[PDB]
């Protein structure tokens, strides 16, 4: 058939969030609060385009806003955050409940120096709305033309012309 079209390796270069999973999970709720809008633009673009090739620039905006989030942590609250993700990182299942005092100190320093309120239980799982300036994909599945259906029956039901017509049965 046709050539599958792939982006170049220069279309795929972006500065990477080179931190570990406990480091991401320790700042997770503040990341969902603060980096909400480009993340939600990207996931709307991702469930609407249904294609990772049409979402590359929104993914770069996600990566950029994540890097700005972690720079803004690093400039202000580096030591409480490091104290918190070290304790998150010790755990096997990476529990939040084992690390409440380091969470309290991290939230205290973040609300003081930056004003970020940690989201309550229930908020980050809400379905939000996103204002976009890209058009809606009119055929994301690239479906071709549908087959024309068989014509229905219409008209009243007249009786059988001279009955069953089975060899000699007149009705």
């Amino acid at each position: 058939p046709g050539i599958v079209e792939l982006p170049s390796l220069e279309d795929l270069k972006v500065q990477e969030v080179k931190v570990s999973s406990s480091v991401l999970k320790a700042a997770a709720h503040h990341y969902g609060a603060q980096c909400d809008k480009p993340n939600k633009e990207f996931m709307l673009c991702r469930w609407e385009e249904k294609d990772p090739r049409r979402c590359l620039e929104e993914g770069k905006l996600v990566n950029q806003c994540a890097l700005e989030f972690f720079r803004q942590i690093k400039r202000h609250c580096a030591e409480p955050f490091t104290e918190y993700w070290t304790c998150i990182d010790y755990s096997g299942l990476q529990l939040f409940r084992r690390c409440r005092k380091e969470q309290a100190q991290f939230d205290k320093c973040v609300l003081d120096k930056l004003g970020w309120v940690r989201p309550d239980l229930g908020e980050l799982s809400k379905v939000t709305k996103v204002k976009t300036d890209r058009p809606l994909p009119e055929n994301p599945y690239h479906s071709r033309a549908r087959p024309e259906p068989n014509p229905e029956v219409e008209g009243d039901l007249k009786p059988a012309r001279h009955g069953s017509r089975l060899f000699f049965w007149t009705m």
């Binding site: 991401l24 999970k25 709720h29 939600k40 990772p52 993914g59």
Partner: protein, 48 residues
């Protein structure tokens, strides 16, 4: 006791799942660039 503690464990589960949900767009963008990187590398090696 199991009533109180299993309600607490459901709240802690929802907290962990909201942490995952906040992390998912970053991981999805990285996964997209990951598989496109790998397909482009395989395409260039198919060409050579």
């Amino acid at each position: 006791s199991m009533m109180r503690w299993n309600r607490e464990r459901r709240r802690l589960q929802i907290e962990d799942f909201e942490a995952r949900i906040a992390l998912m767009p970053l991981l999805q963008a990285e996964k997209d660039r990951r598989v496109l990187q790998m397909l482009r590398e395989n395409l260039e090696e198919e060409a050579t």
